[PDB]
Amino acid sequence: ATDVATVVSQAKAQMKEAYYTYSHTVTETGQFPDIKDVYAAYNKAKQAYANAVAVVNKAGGAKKDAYLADLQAIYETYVFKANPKSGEARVATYIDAYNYATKLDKMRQELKAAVDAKDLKKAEELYHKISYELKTRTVILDRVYGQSTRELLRSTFKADAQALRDRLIYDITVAMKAREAQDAVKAGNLDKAKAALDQVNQYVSKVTDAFKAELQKAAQDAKAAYEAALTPKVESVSAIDSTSFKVTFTKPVDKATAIPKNFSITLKGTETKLYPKSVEVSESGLTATVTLYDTLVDGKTYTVVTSGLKDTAGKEFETSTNEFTYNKPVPASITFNFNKLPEDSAVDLTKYVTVKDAAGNVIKSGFELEFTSSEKLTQGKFINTTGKKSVIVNATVKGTNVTTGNVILAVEDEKAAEVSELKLTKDNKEVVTLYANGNAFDKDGNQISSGTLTLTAKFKDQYGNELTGKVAGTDYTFESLNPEVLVVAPDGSVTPIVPGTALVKVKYGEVTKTIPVTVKANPVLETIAVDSTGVSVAKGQKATFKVTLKDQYGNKFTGNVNVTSDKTETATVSVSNSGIGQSEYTVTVNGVAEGSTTITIKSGTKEVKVPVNVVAGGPVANYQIKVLVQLKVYAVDANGNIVGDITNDVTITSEGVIVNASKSTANGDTVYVITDNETLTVKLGTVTLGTVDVEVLKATVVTKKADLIEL
Numbered sequence: 001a002t003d004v005a006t007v008v009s010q011a012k013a014q015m016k017e018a019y020y021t022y023s024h025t026v027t028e029t030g031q032f033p034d035i036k037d038v039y040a041a042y043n044k045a046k047q048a049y050a051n052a053v054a055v056v057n058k059a060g061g062a063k064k065d066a067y068l069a070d071l072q073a074i075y076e077t078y079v080f081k082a083n084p085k086s087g088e089a090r091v092a093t094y095i096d097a098y099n100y101a102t103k104l105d106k107m108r109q110e111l112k113a114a115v116d117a118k119d120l121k122k123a124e125e126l127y128h129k130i131s132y133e134l135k136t137r138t139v140i141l142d143r144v145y146g147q148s149t150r151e152l153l154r155s156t157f158k159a160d161a162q163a164l165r166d167r168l169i170y171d172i173t174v175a176m177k178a179r180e181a182q183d184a185v186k187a188g189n190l191d192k193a194k195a196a197l198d199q200v201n202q203y204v205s206k207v208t209d210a211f212k213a214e215l216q217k218a219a220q221d222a223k224a225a226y227e228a229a230l231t232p233k234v235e236s237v238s239a240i241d242s243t244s245f246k247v248t249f250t251k252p253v254d255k256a257t258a259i260p261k262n263f264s265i266t267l268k269g270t271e272t273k274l275y276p277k278s279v280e281v282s283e284s285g286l287t288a289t290v291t292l293y294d295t296l297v298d299g300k301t302y303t304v305v306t307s308g309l310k311d312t313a314g315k316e317f318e319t320s321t322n323e324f325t326y327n328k329p330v331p332a333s334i335t336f337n338f339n340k341l342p343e344d345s346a347v348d349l350t351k352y353v354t355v356k357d358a359a360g361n362v363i364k365s366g367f368e369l370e371f372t373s374s375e376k377l378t379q380g381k382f383i384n385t386t387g388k389k390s391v392i393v394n395a396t397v398k399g400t401n402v403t404t405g406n407v408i409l410a411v412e413d414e415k416a417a418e419v420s421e422l423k424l425t426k427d428n429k430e431v432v433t434l435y436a437n438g439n440a441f442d443k444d445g446n447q448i449s450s451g452t453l454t455l456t457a458k459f460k461d462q463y464g465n466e467l468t469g470k471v472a473g474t475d476y477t478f479e480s481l482n483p484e485v486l487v488v489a490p491d492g493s494v495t496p497i498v499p500g501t502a503l504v505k506v507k508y509g510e511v512t513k514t515i516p517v518t519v520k521a522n523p524v525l526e527t528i529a530v531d532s533t534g535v536s537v538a539k540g541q542k543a544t545f546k547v548t549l550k551d552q553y554g555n556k557f558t559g560n561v562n563v564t565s566d567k568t569e570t571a572t573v574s575v576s577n578s579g580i581g582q583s584e585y586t587v588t589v590n591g592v593a594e595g596s597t598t599i600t601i602k603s604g605t606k607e608v609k610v611p612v613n614v615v616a617g618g619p620v621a622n623y624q625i626k627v628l629v630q631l632k633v634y635a636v637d638a639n640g641n642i643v644g645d646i647t648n649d650v651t652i653t654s655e656g657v658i659v660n661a662s663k664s665t666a667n668g669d670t671v672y673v674i675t676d677n678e679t680l681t682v683k684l685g686t687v688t689l690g691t692v693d694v695e696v697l698k699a700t701v702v703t704k705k706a707d708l709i710e711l
Contacts, residue, residue, distance in 0.1 A: 004059045008067055011052035012074055018045040019078045019090045026149045032156075035098055042079065042091050049075045084143065084709060092708045093143040099706065100140045101157035104133060108161040115168075115210045120175060123210070127172050130165050134158070139711060170206045173199065174215050178222045185229045193226055231318055232311045237304045239326040240365050244291040247304070247322075252285035257310040263290055264305040267297075268323065274302070285312060296326035329366040331397045332358035340410040341391065342463055346382040349373075353395045353404070368398040385411045416476070417462040419513035422506055424494070427451020435522050436496050454492035457506045457513075476508035485519060523551040525559055525604055534611040535599070537571070537591040538643045541617070545610075547601055548584040556583035561603050563587060570597040571612050591615075617643035625682055625690045629699045631661075631672035633682065633689065647671060650689065653681050659694055674699065 018041040025033045049071060056067045075081075081089040107130050114123035141158070144150045177196045184193035204219050232251040239245050245265075258281045265274040274294045281288040296302065301323055309317035333356045341347055349371050355363045374392040375383040385391060388411045396403040423430050426440045426448045433441035441447045455478050459467040470476060473491035480488040486502035487495050496519045505514035532545030551557040560580050565573045570593050576586045589599065591614035600609045618637030623646070626632045631652070635644030648670040652661045660675035679702070680692040691702045 004056055004063070004067065007052050007055045008071060011048045011071060014048040015045045015074050015078050018042050022091065022094050023146055023149065026146060026152060030152070032098065032152070035095070038091065038095060038098070042095065045075075045079045045091070049079070080708070082709070086143065087145050089143075089709060090145045093140075093145070094149065096140050096707050096709055097144045097153055100133070100137060101153045104130070104161040105157045107133070108164055111164060111168075118210060118214075120171075120211045120214055123168070124172055124175055127165060127168055130161060134161060134165060137711075140707070143709070167208060168210075170203050171208055171211055171215065174203050174207060174219060175211070178215070178218045181222045182225055185225050190226070190230065197223060197226065231316075232309075232314065233318060234306050234309075234320050234322055237322045237324045239296060239324050240289065241367075242295045242326070242328065243293075244289050245296075245302075245304070245324055246287055247290060247306075248287045249285070251314065252312040253281060253288070254310040254312055254314075255281055255285070257308060258288050260290075262306065262308045264307075265290075265292065265302055266305075268301045268303050298326065298328040301325045329363045330357055331355050331363055331367050331400055331402050334395055334397060334402050334404050336393070336395070336404060336407055336409065338409075338463065340412040340462075341385050341393075342461075343385050343388075343411055343413040345384050345386055346378065347385050349377075349381050349383060349393060349395065355397065355402075367400075370396050370398055412462070414461040414463070414465070414467065416459045416467060416470075416508040416511045418460045418464075419506060419508075419511060420458045420460045420466060422455065422457045422513050422515050424453075424515075424517050425456045426453045434496060434517070434519050436499050436519060437522055438496065453494045455488065455494065455504065455506065456492065457508075459508055459511070470508075476506060478504065478506050480504045481514075486517065521552070523553070523555065523557055525557055525606060526550055526552040528601060528603055528606060528608045530601065530608055530610060532610060535589050535613075536641070537589050537612070537614050538617045538637075538641045539591045539594060539614055541591050541642060543589040543591075544586055545589075546584060546586050547608075549603065558583050559603055561585055561601060563602070564600050565589075565597050565612065566600075567597045569593055570595045571599075571614050573599060573612075615639070615641055617641070620644060623684070623689050625692065625701050627692075627699050627701060629674045629694075629697075630664075631674070631692070631699075633684075646684065650682055650684050653683065654678055655681065658696060 018038075021038055021041045022033055025031055052071055053068065056064055056071070077088050078090050080092045084093060107126060111123060111126045111130060114120075114126060138158075141150065141153060144153065177199045181193040181196035181200065184190065184196065200219055200222065204215060207215050232249065232253075235248040235250055237245055237247045247263075258279050260276040260279055263276045263279065265276065266272060267274070274292050274296075276290050277293050278291045279288055280291075290304075302325075303321055303323050305319070305321055306317060307319040311317075335354050335356070337352050337354055341352060350369055353369065355367060357363055369381070371377055371381060372394045373383050375385070375388070377383060383391065383393075390411060391409050392406050393409055394404060394406050424434070425431065426442075427450060429442045429448050429451075431440040431448070431453075432443055433445075438453070439447055440453060454472075457472070457476065457478075459470070459476070461467055472478075473489075477490045478488050478492050479490070480486050481503040482501075485496070485498055485500045486504065487497060488504055499519050499521045501516055501518045503514055503516055505512055527550040529548045529550060530545060531547070535543045535545060537543040547561065549557045549559055549561075558581070561575060562579055563573055563575045565571050572590045572592060574588050574590075576582075576588075579585070587599070587601070589612055594614055594616045596611075596613045598609055599612050600607065618639065618641070620635045620643065621638045622636045624634045624636050624642075626634060631647070632645070633647045633650045634642045635646055637643050648663065648665075650672075652672055655678065658676065658678045659680070661672060661680065664671050664673045674694065676696070678694060680694060682689045682692065690704075693700055693702055
């Protein structure tokens with residue numbers, strides 16, 4: 001009993017016994033032992049060893065160092081050794097591994113919690129945590145002695161942690177990369193974006209049904225953002241005649257920057273420069289004529305260089321080089337586009353002629369025209385057809401003998417020939433949605449407040465020009481083919497009566513066009529969505545869940561909500577904003593006495609009810625630090641139930657200070673807050689409750705390293 005030999009025999013046998021605890025269970029029954037029993041046996045080992053070392057040194061002798069070397073060898077192999085080789089520190093590494101393996105299973109459920117409740121911000125957060133453990137920290141798992149044991153840990157706890165993570169590859173890839181391309185346009189880096197959208201746009205096909213909805217919006221919203229803030233550019237340049245060239249733009253252009261100073265033209269592959277005389281810009285601002293002093297050369301190519309140009313209310317153009325190739329066309333035939341001309345003081349004869357080459361191609365520009373007419377020509381191209389019945393016009397190309405000959409032309413006053421457009425509008429905006437209410441919603445989805453609801457029409461005449469000065473109601477009129485569904489005034493005014501569809505049409509003399517405008521059912525209360533599946537409060541505490549209302553189309557419906565609990569004694573209840581106004585309230589459940597009851601959310605016709613069970617508060621067994629950036633410190637009993645809160649006594653400090661933080665009381669309920677110009681330490685008195693990591697905005701609460709064998 002007392003003698004060293006007996007103490008060492010037993011110390012030896014005991015350290016081995018700690019290892020057989022797990023290895024004989026796993027081998028013989030295919031089960032893990034109770035981790036409590038392993039910890040019990042591990043601590044009993046570490047003592048038995050340490051007692052023996054003490055007993056051995058106290059006896060001394062030549063037997064001493066043999067004993068001590070053996071004892072240590074067993075201890076270092078079977079129980080514990082800092083930085084172990086494989087086969088060593090068996091029990092220690094199994095503990096580490098079994099604790100590691102249980103965290104995965106847990107996180108894997110927390111992750112499956114988020115995919116179900118469809119919180120994408122949280123599913124991503126836990127995807128990262130899991131993907132780190134699964135990649136970096138499987139080292140812990142490989143230390144374990146016992147391939148049988150090593151597999152059982154992998155099958156029982158890791159296999160399904162993998163599986164679940166691996167099918168969220170795509171959901172996260174997109175959600176990440178979408179956010180990155182959104183962040184590249186806030187900054188000035190369109191190169192990094194696009195490579196991001198290249199990635200987003202090949203993977204949104206393969207997302208799972210979890211967040212399919214939210215990912216698509218975030219993907220389309222990242223495309224849109226990138227378009228709107230894309231650098232304007234010169235599309236192309238093309239010749240017009242021997243002395244002017246056209247230039248087209250991607251965006252509109254600032255008339256103040258479209259000036260001769262900002263264009264440089266050279267004959268390609270030479271020093272020969274051609275200075276521009278003028279720049280005229282289209283009413284739209286997407287093209288411009290640039291005219292030259294010098295004369296272009298049939299066949300040759302010219303390179304234009306743009307710079308210091310600018311968008312309307314916008315940003316600079318990229319200095320760029322574009323070529324164009326002057327080709328003097330060869331006219332063969334010439335023709336009038338109609339047998340008639342409009343009635344007018346100045347009819348511009350060049351607009352009513354068409355020139356072609358011998359192949360049969362219309363030459364849009366390049367040539368000059370001479371005219372003779374029965375009537376007097378002004379600037380050799382304009383005539384007064386006012387009050388005339390007919391006119392003779394002869395059009396010839398200048399150097400050529402290509403002529404129309406003498407052509408008699410009828411003069412015919414403009415008249416509505418065609419309906420160029422007909423749409424429903426309100427306050428200048430085309431409406432895509434309308435309910436029998438009268439409420440109207442535009443292209444995007446937003447409703448148009450104020451402005452009259454009317455039909456709009458434009459017309460072209462028989463020469464294909466838009467008609468102007470024409471008063472709706474006087475010169476043309478509207479009507480509905482179904483007054484039951486939709487009532488229309490002659491001037492365009494509208495007031496719908498009932499859902500369905502109505503055919504509506506416009507009339508300018510004998511010209512008409514008919515359009516359908518569908519009118520839809522009013523928004524009515526279809527769904528009451530609830531944030532919580534079921535509430536677990538504590539006595540003398542409170543809980544929160546949100547209620548959102550939806551209509552039959554799936555849009556935020558505004559309405560009323562009363563809320564009640566079965567039994568007022570086990571749990572009272574209230575609702576935000578007095579129970580009226582919004583499409584989304586927050587319910588507050590107070591606990592008052594242990595047991596159960598249930599909560600009812602009513603709204604007009606339809607109704608949802610939800611379970612409430614209040615637990616009796618245990619004593620304080622822990623303090624959680626939580627991020628909800630705004631910070632809190634909850635007191636928490638043995639079960640994880642929130643009883644008490646101590647955010648007000650606690651003090652934040654820092655270990656180059658990126659962040660400021662201080663207490664922020666609101667109606668008694670205290671909260672900590674983060675600012676800007678590290679890791680923060682949360683203390684209660686001189687005790688440290690934990691640390692926080694902050695980055696640049698985003699804050700995660702540190703987790704304490706609980707590994708026996710550091711890596």
